Amino acid sequence: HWGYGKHNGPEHWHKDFPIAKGERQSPVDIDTHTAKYDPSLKPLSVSYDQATSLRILNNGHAFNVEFDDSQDKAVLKGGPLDGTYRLIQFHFHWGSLDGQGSEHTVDKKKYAAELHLVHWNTKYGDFGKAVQQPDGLAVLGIFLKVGSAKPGLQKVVDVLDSIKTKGKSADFTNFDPRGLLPESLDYWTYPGSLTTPPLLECVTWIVLKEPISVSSEQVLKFRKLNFNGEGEPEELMVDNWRPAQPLKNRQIKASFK
Numbered sequence: 515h516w517g518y519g520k521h522n523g524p525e526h527w528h529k530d531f532p533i534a535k536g537e538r539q540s541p542v543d544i545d546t547h548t549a550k551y552d553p554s555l556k557p558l559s560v561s562y563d564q565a566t567s568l569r570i571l572n573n574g575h576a577f578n579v580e581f582d583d584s585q586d587k588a589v590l591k592g593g594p595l596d597g598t599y600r601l602i603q604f605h606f607h608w609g610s611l612d613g614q615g616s617e618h619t620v621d622k623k624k625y626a627a628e629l630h631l632v633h634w635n636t637k638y639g640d641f642g643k644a645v646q647q648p649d650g651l652a653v654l655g656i657f658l659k660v661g662s663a664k665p666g667l668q669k670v671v672d673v674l675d676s677i678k679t680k681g682k683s684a685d686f687t688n689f690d691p692r693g694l695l696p697e698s699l700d701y702w703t704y705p706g707s708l709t710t711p712p713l714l715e716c717v718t719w720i721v722l723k724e725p726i727s728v729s730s731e732q733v734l735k736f737r738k739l740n741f742n743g744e745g746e747p748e749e750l751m752v753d754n755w756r757p758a759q760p761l762k763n764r765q766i767k768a769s770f771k
């Protein structure tokens with residue numbers, strides 16, 4: 515149905531998902547000069563040492579690495595959050611060129627890609643219940659800039675060949691998500707939504723100030739994925755990002771000065 519093409523892209527989404535024009539839609543532009551430093555903000559607590567990755571799959575929109583979330587194995591706490599949020603999956607959004615790809619922008623600046631680590635609030639029992647709550651999900655957004663290779667990313671880059679087309683999956687166990695984190699945990703935070711349909715407004719966004727760098731060849735391999743299924747006409751998976759949405763009645767808080 516929906517996609518990122520001229521005929522089914524972001525500009526058409528509202529027809530099937532009216533919330534597209536809601537009050538707390540993501541992503542947004544982070545204007546650094548008007549974001550408010552909040553000293554009551556606690557530091558983030560990322561406990562990914564017991565993370566259990568299971569699979570990687572191309573869902574026709576991006577590739578997602580899924581984790582075992584049956585127990586508190588990889589959780590996010592602290593920051594603007596109240597409660598424990600479990601990591602369920604992470605995916606990327608990237609562009610056809612190095613100067614675009616991220617969904618959130620900083621002072622209108624676009625990065626080559628953006629990593630989203632999706633977590634759901636454990637007080638709600640399961641992910642499905644979490645998506646029915648204003649504080650159900652917490653997504654950690656990390657910008658990727660092209661530069662030196664990211665060692666922790668290569669394992670992911672190496673398996674892309676086997677999940678070239680939509681619907682394909684591959685076992686992807688023992689992957690450590692900690693290799694994808696920048697050195698600093700400083701962040702911006704604001705209430706938002708999922709950036710793809712159903713565009714549910716259940717997300718507390720936490721965007722890290724510090725981006726990680728990846729090589730030209732690493733992001734290049736992202737661009738060789740296919741939106742289409744096997745046997746269908748080939749369509750390269752690129753520019754799977756949604757444009758910035760109006761901030762409206764929201765303010766972006768910064769954990770740093």
Ligand SMILES: COc1ccc(CNS(=O)(=O)c2ccc(S(N)(=O)=O)s2)cc1
Nearest residue numbers: 630632645653707708709710711712714
């Ligand atoms: C049945 O109810 C639902 C509710 C939500 C989904 C979306 N799936 S999802 O949570 O993995 C995400 C989609 C986009 C994400 S972004 N780019 O904002 O981080 S996270 C599926 C079924």
Ligand SMILES: [Hg+2]
Nearest residue numbers: 646647715716
């Ligand atoms: Hg919600």
Ligand SMILES: [Zn+2]
Nearest residue numbers: 605607630709
């Ligand atoms: Zn995303």
